[PDB]
Scaffold this active site. Structure first.
Site, PDB file in Angstrom:
ATOM      1  N   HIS A 229       0.925  -1.135   0.000  1.00 21.77           N
ATOM      2  CA  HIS A 229       0.000   0.000   0.000  1.00 21.77           C
ATOM      3  C   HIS A 229       0.980   1.202   0.000  1.00 21.77           C
ATOM      4  O   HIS A 229       2.026   1.060   0.657  1.00 21.77           O
ATOM      5  CB  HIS A 229      -0.846   0.222   1.264  1.00 21.77           C
ATOM      6  CG  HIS A 229      -1.893  -0.823   1.478  1.00 21.77           C
ATOM      7  ND1 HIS A 229      -1.697  -1.979   2.207  1.00 21.77           N
ATOM      8  CD2 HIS A 229      -3.181  -0.839   1.068  1.00 21.77           C
ATOM      9  CE1 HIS A 229      -2.819  -2.676   2.208  1.00 21.77           C
ATOM     10  NE2 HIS A 229      -3.721  -2.001   1.545  1.00 21.77           N
TER      11      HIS A 229
ATOM     12  N   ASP B 277       2.373   1.791   3.293  1.00 21.59           N
ATOM     13  CA  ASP B 277       3.130   0.724   3.933  1.00 21.59           C
ATOM     14  C   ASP B 277       4.631   1.055   3.709  1.00 21.59           C
ATOM     15  O   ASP B 277       5.407   0.808   4.647  1.00 21.59           O
ATOM     16  CB  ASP B 277       2.890  -0.683   3.414  1.00 21.59           C
ATOM     17  CG  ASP B 277       1.486  -1.213   3.472  1.00 21.59           C
ATOM     18  OD1 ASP B 277       0.807  -0.909   4.470  1.00 21.59           O
ATOM     19  OD2 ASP B 277       1.073  -1.930   2.542  1.00 21.59           O
TER      20      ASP B 277
ATOM     21  N   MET C  88       1.839  -6.040  -8.205  1.00 22.44           N
ATOM     22  CA  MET C  88       0.629  -5.241  -7.965  1.00 22.44           C
ATOM     23  C   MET C  88       0.919  -4.204  -6.917  1.00 22.44           C
ATOM     24  O   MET C  88       1.805  -4.500  -6.135  1.00 22.44           O
ATOM     25  CB  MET C  88      -0.404  -6.264  -7.449  1.00 22.44           C
ATOM     26  CG  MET C  88      -1.722  -5.766  -6.964  1.00 22.44           C
ATOM     27  SD  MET C  88      -1.751  -5.208  -5.234  1.00 22.44           S
ATOM     28  CE  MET C  88      -1.894  -6.659  -4.247  1.00 22.44           C
TER      29      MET C  88
ATOM     30  N   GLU D 280     -11.702  -5.237  -4.996  1.00 21.97           N
ATOM     31  CA  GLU D 280     -11.726  -6.287  -3.961  1.00 21.97           C
ATOM     32  C   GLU D 280     -12.967  -6.137  -3.076  1.00 21.97           C
ATOM     33  O   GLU D 280     -13.090  -5.138  -2.344  1.00 21.97           O
ATOM     34  CB  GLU D 280     -10.480  -6.215  -3.094  1.00 21.97           C
ATOM     35  CG  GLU D 280     -10.336  -7.239  -1.983  1.00 21.97           C
ATOM     36  CD  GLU D 280      -8.936  -7.304  -1.427  1.00 21.97           C
ATOM     37  OE1 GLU D 280      -7.977  -6.721  -1.906  1.00 21.97           O
ATOM     38  OE2 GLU D 280      -8.885  -8.022  -0.407  1.00 21.97           O
TER      39      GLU D 280
ATOM     40  N   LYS E  72     -15.688  -7.187  -0.153  1.00 22.78           N
ATOM     41  CA  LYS E  72     -15.662  -7.554   1.273  1.00 22.78           C
ATOM     42  C   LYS E  72     -17.046  -7.173   1.814  1.00 22.78           C
ATOM     43  O   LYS E  72     -17.543  -6.076   1.504  1.00 22.78           O
ATOM     44  CB  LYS E  72     -14.535  -6.891   2.043  1.00 22.78           C
ATOM     45  CG  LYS E  72     -14.427  -7.405   3.486  1.00 22.78           C
ATOM     46  CD  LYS E  72     -13.305  -6.699   4.220  1.00 22.78           C
ATOM     47  CE  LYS E  72     -12.763  -7.430   5.400  1.00 22.78           C
ATOM     48  NZ  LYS E  72     -11.824  -6.620   6.218  1.00 22.78           N
TER      49      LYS E  72
ATOM     50  N   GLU F   1     -10.962 -12.367  -2.091  1.00 19.96           N
ATOM     51  CA  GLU F   1     -10.163 -12.890  -0.983  1.00 19.96           C
ATOM     52  C   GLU F   1     -10.898 -14.040  -0.297  1.00 19.96           C
ATOM     53  O   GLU F   1     -12.084 -13.903   0.021  1.00 19.96           O
ATOM     54  CB  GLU F   1      -9.956 -11.837   0.103  1.00 19.96           C
ATOM     55  CG  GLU F   1      -9.067 -12.255   1.288  1.00 19.96           C
ATOM     56  CD  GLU F   1      -8.453 -11.099   2.021  1.00 19.96           C
ATOM     57  OE1 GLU F   1      -7.761 -10.343   1.273  1.00 19.96           O
ATOM     58  OE2 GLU F   1      -8.595 -10.832   3.194  1.00 19.96           O
TER      59      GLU F   1
ATOM     60  N   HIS G 125     -12.899 -13.179   2.827  1.00 20.49           N
ATOM     61  CA  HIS G 125     -13.967 -12.214   2.550  1.00 20.49           C
ATOM     62  C   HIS G 125     -15.239 -12.950   2.158  1.00 20.49           C
ATOM     63  O   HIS G 125     -16.265 -12.591   2.724  1.00 20.49           O
ATOM     64  CB  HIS G 125     -13.662 -11.197   1.431  1.00 20.49           C
ATOM     65  CG  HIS G 125     -12.533 -10.287   1.822  1.00 20.49           C
ATOM     66  ND1 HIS G 125     -12.123  -9.212   1.076  1.00 20.49           N
ATOM     67  CD2 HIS G 125     -11.751 -10.313   2.924  1.00 20.49           C
ATOM     68  CE1 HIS G 125     -11.137  -8.603   1.694  1.00 20.49           C
ATOM     69  NE2 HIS G 125     -10.890  -9.247   2.818  1.00 20.49           N
TER      70      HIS G 125
ATOM     71  N   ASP H 299      -6.420 -13.016  -3.525  1.00 20.22           N
ATOM     72  CA  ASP H 299      -5.833 -12.923  -2.190  1.00 20.22           C
ATOM     73  C   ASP H 299      -6.197 -14.241  -1.471  1.00 20.22           C
ATOM     74  O   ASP H 299      -7.412 -14.489  -1.284  1.00 20.22           O
ATOM     75  CB  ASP H 299      -6.370 -11.733  -1.429  1.00 20.22           C
ATOM     76  CG  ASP H 299      -5.746 -10.396  -1.760  1.00 20.22           C
ATOM     77  OD1 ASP H 299      -4.805 -10.304  -2.566  1.00 20.22           O
ATOM     78  OD2 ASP H 299      -6.247  -9.403  -1.164  1.00 20.22           O
TER      79      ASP H 299
ATOM     80  N   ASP I  95     -12.631 -10.954  10.438  1.00 21.07           N
ATOM     81  CA  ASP I  95     -11.686 -11.466   9.432  1.00 21.07           C
ATOM     82  C   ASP I  95     -10.426 -11.879  10.200  1.00 21.07           C
ATOM     83  O   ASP I  95      -9.744 -11.065  10.833  1.00 21.07           O
ATOM     84  CB  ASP I  95     -11.508 -10.510   8.258  1.00 21.07           C
ATOM     85  CG  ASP I  95     -11.261  -9.066   8.596  1.00 21.07           C
ATOM     86  OD1 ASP I  95     -11.844  -8.468   9.524  1.00 21.07           O
ATOM     87  OD2 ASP I  95     -10.399  -8.529   7.858  1.00 21.07           O
TER      88      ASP I  95
ATOM     89  N   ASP J 197      -7.702 -13.765   8.787  1.00 21.25           N
ATOM     90  CA  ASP J 197      -6.488 -13.678   7.976  1.00 21.25           C
ATOM     91  C   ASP J 197      -5.457 -14.739   8.372  1.00 21.25           C
ATOM     92  O   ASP J 197      -4.271 -14.372   8.473  1.00 21.25           O
ATOM     93  CB  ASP J 197      -5.908 -12.264   8.080  1.00 21.25           C
ATOM     94  CG  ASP J 197      -6.553 -11.148   7.310  1.00 21.25           C
ATOM     95  OD1 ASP J 197      -7.136 -11.352   6.248  1.00 21.25           O
ATOM     96  OD2 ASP J 197      -6.520  -9.960   7.710  1.00 21.25           O
TER      97      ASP J 197
ATOM     98  N   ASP K 223      -2.645 -12.719   1.462  1.00 23.71           N
ATOM     99  CA  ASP K 223      -3.013 -11.466   2.210  1.00 23.71           C
ATOM    100  C   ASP K 223      -3.489 -12.050   3.553  1.00 23.71           C
ATOM    101  O   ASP K 223      -4.683 -12.358   3.715  1.00 23.71           O
ATOM    102  CB  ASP K 223      -4.013 -10.636   1.438  1.00 23.71           C
ATOM    103  CG  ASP K 223      -4.528  -9.410   2.136  1.00 23.71           C
ATOM    104  OD1 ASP K 223      -4.005  -9.171   3.252  1.00 23.71           O
ATOM    105  OD2 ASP K 223      -5.410  -8.661   1.682  1.00 23.71           O
TER     106      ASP K 223
HETATM  107  O1  LIG Z   1      -9.575  -6.847   4.357  1.00 21.12           O
HETATM  108  C1  LIG Z   1      -8.305  -6.238   4.138  1.00 21.12           C
HETATM  109  C2  LIG Z   1      -8.002  -6.331   2.657  1.00 21.12           C
HETATM  110  O2  LIG Z   1      -7.876  -7.714   2.314  1.00 21.12           O
HETATM  111  C3  LIG Z   1      -6.747  -5.531   2.274  1.00 21.12           C
HETATM  112  O3  LIG Z   1      -5.570  -6.243   2.674  1.00 21.12           O
HETATM  113  C4  LIG Z   1      -6.659  -5.267   0.774  1.00 21.12           C
HETATM  114  O4  LIG Z   1      -6.518  -6.459  -0.019  1.00 21.12           O
HETATM  115  C5  LIG Z   1      -5.575  -4.255   0.466  1.00 21.12           C
HETATM  116  O5  LIG Z   1      -6.049  -2.949   0.718  1.00 21.12           O
HETATM  117 MG   LIG Z   2      -7.076  -8.569   0.387  1.00 21.54          MG
END
Ligand SMILES: O=C[C@H](O)[C@@H](O)[C@H](O)CO
Ligand SMILES: [Mg+2]
Ligand SMILES: O=C[C@H](O)[C@@H](O)[C@H](O)CO
Ligand SMILES: O=C[C@H](O)[C@@H](O)[C@H](O)CO
Ligand SMILES: O=C[C@H](O)[C@@H](O)[C@H](O)CO
Ligand SMILES: [Mg+2]
Ligand SMILES: [Mg+2]
Ligand SMILES: [Mg+2]
Lengths: 392, 392, 391, 392
Positions: free
Chosen positions: D52, D55, D86, D179, D181, D215, D218, D243, D253, D255, D290
């Protein structure tokens, strides 16, 4: 309407004081001064305030500072007339508690967690609090093989027994309320529902001193009927305290204003707590709001949200009473046989011997005819809702 | 591998016999003869068969009919060597039970529900069953105002105390296991999770004769950790029986073959049951499969699925064994400090006074240093999964 | 009180549901269709809908079939009820155990199309304008059992044919795909309103296809029903709507509209009625796809039918009052709801102009803007108070 | 066993760099140096890194600082051979984005959000990135009346159309991946599923430049089938990126590492991506993780977890290949008619009239007889799980 001290609306310092730093973003509001909080809450109608040790006194404060903060805090209470009905301890923020407090795999952390609570019990006792809420937010695991649940329940019990011992010996007279939560922050938290928490408490040394502190959102996170679980809690006599807020089913814990999530269940909950037997409320403790003003709001939105909690409860209360007083509802309750459930299944003095002798309970029972009669539950529900909409 | 009678695999007559009439369609299979079901189960390695009164004897069969069925059944049992370890009663199918059995708002239904169960206890006791499973599928509500929960728990309790009494007096030696379920067929069912059932059981006249019969998919319908709930049931010593199946989180109850839903939780469950304390299993009752062959299958698919349940259990057992006998896993367990949870937090003879005096528990505790040590949980989870995958 | 302009419709199968559930026998006897028409006309319904098999029992000979239709048409006539939509049962019979249009078995797929063509002719005959397609058996219990890609090809192949037929015969039907995440299959193809719209965009005559979202179906996944309807309206694909109540992710309850998520039932009526002009944002039938609870007899059935209409009209009234309130107008202004309707860019502005605006970045005080509140809780509170008749 | 650059494993700098500051606690790990991250990922087998804007360059760095950071980062890629497939922009952390970036009700925020992205697009293009991922985390609401969804979609579209215009005019040749969610951090997010994101994309000015970046967790937060969703995305040809991670149903979430949540779905997913038409993968982009190393771990735990993702993917690939290669599986597939779905329903040149004239498709069709044949799906499923378990 207007809140009175008799309504016993309380709020945690961490609620209106939540700075709005979430999992994905920085804080949107500056820190709230505790003294101001006391004043603002006294102003909106709250009768009490609660807090975690670390909400009031910054983690790692020297004695002088700590002492300094408390003294100012007591003044504010003094001045405003607010009380501290409950106190709690933060066993979830500091990195040392990443695997739990009482049930950390690490023995040194467990010992530390107990010390930390003992100290809050003292401050609680000194401020006149009656209840110690215990939320084991870090008790649980992300992976099955990383936590021996049986050992964890032993260690949890071992810590609780000690706290009860201490309180009784020091003459503090506290009651302990275990707060269940299914997940967040751990993948799976121990004592995930009101049920598991009650079952657990029954295994302690002085079970009479232990109850639960169920929160609306916690049960809803698992899609359970909050009202029904509270009804079971009351049946067992373990509703020592209650956390009110709103949630939209199984997702992260939203902590919305009470009644902003499942409105229908918020309605039936108020009806259960207030339209108790012998007219009176079935529950007499604090009506505590453990919610969070949305991240999109400023300090004005904060006070607005604090007031919304009170208005929601009083508006619902108002409709629950009207509902119960409605003759048409009375007629519907009768057709639904709601009250026939209160009459024992067996006649006084009847046991299995007499039940077995009753041909009308089996051999000559017409299941088919009984099975054809409806209970009128939809009509009864329709009337509850029209009462809620102020349509009657 | 091969199933042995020591494995104690049992199936309900209603599993392999489900004709597959679902909520949206007609049956896809013809009825299975009970005698034939006994032979087929025996042939795949089951040690026992279970049934609801109405699965064996059609509802409303005259006494000659019922007697004939029972006799043919006993012969098959005799001939095959299968046993009947548990029996249960259907208090959900007939329209008369639309508002429940023991807790219907209608008094006469409550009286009939008890007689239907007493009759089944007799047959159970005659077949040698040791457990009576109670699944109150119709006990609950679709609307909050339609059911007084407190009255309902009173009535539930009233019925169960009578049953224990009768069993006690007749010398049947039965153990009672309440089976929790959150919903389906009622919008909300009373005693929704293993926790709520355990807490309830503790309030009966003779708690010692009562435990729970938790089902894999039932807890997963609430998105709870089944293994962790079983661990708590075992801590309370209330795991009287268990129903194994598969489910995909919160949705209708799928009743897939055990292990076809949450595979990782199935794995940790088998580890828990079999790798109990002292080499031996932590649980010794039947490993009962309460599942349904998918509606897309014919009788070939039905026996395939019956065999898949056993295969799944044995494969996971093999992998759980290997997991624990791995010096690398052992090393990870030590690094993750799993066993250290088993050591009391307090030293022998240490009380609060001594704890309060230990500056190493607080005053000189370096929280910050401990907080920085990693537990190695991910690595441990990875080894577990590699064992399951047969990669180790 | 309901008017024909309210456009309340009910499926024959809602009031006619005998309450035979996954775990119990039926608690009610069969409802006669002529009788249903008469009772619905009486409670204020403007129309009735049905699956082929709800009116004409599966396998009726032509004489029988013909007799039933003539009777039904007469009841319609007498009461003045219309048939806004018709649908086909592609889920009950054992042959459909793996799907109608996407069954692995080629012969079932062919039969599935013949069953629908036939229902299309009857719908056409009765004046129906919409064909609802609920692919309840399309999906799977196991991932390796269904090739999703081939399934979509076959779903598409079948629909293109239906559209060809309708268009050649001059039927003028609109097709509405009904999404559901699960039940009866472990996973159903086209699980949400979004999946169904995306799919429809890939057909040969997309303009003829839309969706028929159901309150309960989106809620089974814990999705915001109102918000999905808003997106459907934005794509202009809301061809029909099925209203009912649900309590989150669990089996489909099919409760009366508004008896599940009441707040979302309120925002939905606001959306459909407080449309663009002053006018409704949606002009189709308000269809109740619900089930009278198994605990009820026929008195309960008629009460539950009326409850659906009552909930909508009560919500409508409060929605209207909400919008007319000056205190609400003020909160809407403070929350900047309407500012979202103003384009981000000034007319004639492109990336080159945006890039030259130092105030959109280089000199932008994000810290300052980030500190002002939106006042959303307060706005929410006014809404609930309108709902409770507290204002 | 070992990863190759041909495997295309990528990791976001924010994944291994996550300091573990969650909703209830403080960070448990120190900050990770971008340069160090590059070397460690290169080392564990990753082919690329993503980030990002915020980041890599701390929000508000001057150009001198910004520039220096970029230069060092660039060096590291150089020495290690890692690429940047990306890039993404942070439109969720800063308080200004509390009501969204592109869809904030505040017009000034919307202009600002576009500018932030254009800038990141520039850096992306300079580093060779081919995909711009857009995760609209703050686009949505907690309350229904607060957000005009229609206006919101117009403003989302307006912003995206400008971005495509620019890339195309500057000749960047980027592809845009939306993306989806369902929630977290907003109560409800716009474009909640892969399906909603695809439908929306179809409405842009140059739809061919747009696709989705779905993702695992998600889609699983809504209890949807991730594999089936991907299957649909592939059918539409909109799977531009992906992702991978793990989740345990509808809850916050998590992860987790890829395959540590729904293992069975992780399996069918690898099978779908890798066993494409004619041997070749069905998907050619990066296999991007991710995820977040659990809060209980240290940097050791961090690298372990990075490698666990790769391991999980390669172990699953290996079993998917073997599953498909097994003649027994091939036989079960045939019996289940899985490939028969590939044959058109209609014969060549057949239309409605020929079909209406075919009596075998209706009039002479024996539905009862076809309805009774089983599909053999449980058995096919059992074969798949046995391959997964390494038992076949
Ligand atoms: O839920 C968080 C998202 O997965 C984030 O990591 C995006 O993929 C990037 O902004
Ligand atoms: Mg993601
Ligand atoms: O989920 C967070 C808990 O609700 C917390 O606020 C407790 O009640 C107090 O520790
Ligand atoms: O959900 C159905 C129940 O699981 C049932 O099978 C009981 O175990 C016995 O009636
Ligand atoms: O879930 C059942 C469906 O909603 C069905 O009634 C369709 O709307 C018509 O087949
Ligand atoms: Mg709380
Ligand atoms: Mg069971
Ligand atoms: Mg419908």
């Amino acid at each position: 309407v207007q809140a009175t001290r008799e309504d016993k609306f309380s709020f945690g310092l961490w609620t209106v004081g939540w700075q709005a730093r979430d999992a994905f973003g920085d804080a949107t509001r500056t820190a709230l001064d505790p003294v101001e909080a006391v004043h603002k809450l006294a102003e909106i109608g709250a009768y009490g305030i609660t807090f975690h040790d670390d909400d009031l006194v910054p983690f790692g404060s020297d004695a002088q500072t700590r002492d300094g903060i408390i003294a100012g805090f007591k003044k504010a209470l003094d001045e405003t007339g607010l009380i501290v009905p409950m106190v709690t301890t933060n066993l979830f923020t500091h990195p040392v508690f990443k695997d739990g407090g009482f049930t950390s795999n690490d023995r040194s952390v467990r010992r530390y967690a107990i010390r930390k609570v003992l100290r809050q019990m003292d401050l609680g006792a000194e401020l006149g609090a009656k209840t110690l809420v215990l939320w084991g937010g870090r008790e649980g695991a992300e992976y099955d093989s990383a936590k021996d649940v049986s050992a964890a329940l032993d260690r949890y019990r071992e810590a609780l027994n000690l706290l009860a011992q201490y309180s009784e010996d020091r003459g503090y007279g506290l009651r302990f309320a275990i707060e269940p939560k299914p997940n967040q922050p751990r993948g799976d938290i121990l004592l995930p529902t009101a049920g598991h928490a009650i079952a657990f408490v029954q295994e302690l040394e002085r079970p009479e001193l232990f109850g639960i502190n169920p929160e609306t959102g916690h049960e809803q996170m698992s899609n359970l009927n909050f009202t029904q679980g509270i009804a079971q809690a009351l049946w067992h006599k373990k509703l020592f305290h209650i956390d009110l807020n709103g949630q939209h089913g199984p997702k992260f814990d939203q902590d919305l204003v009470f009644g902003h999530g499942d409105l229908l269940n918020a309605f039936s909950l108020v009806d259960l707590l207030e339209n108790g037997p012998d007219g009176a409320p079935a529950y007499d403790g604090p009506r505590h709001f453990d919610y969070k003003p949305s991240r999109t709001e400023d300090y004005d939105g904060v006070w607005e949200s604090a007031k919304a909690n009170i208005r929601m409860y009083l508006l619902l209360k108002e409709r629950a009473k009207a509902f119960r007083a409605d003759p048409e509802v009375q007629e519907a309750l009768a057709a639904s046989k709601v009250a026939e459930l209160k009459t024992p299944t067996l006649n006084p003095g009847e046991g299995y011997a007499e039940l077995l002798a009753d041909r009308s309970a089996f051999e000559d029972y017409d299941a088919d005819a009984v099975g054809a009669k409806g209970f009128g539950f939809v009509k009864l529900n329709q009337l509850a809702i029209e009462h809620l909409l102020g349509a009657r």
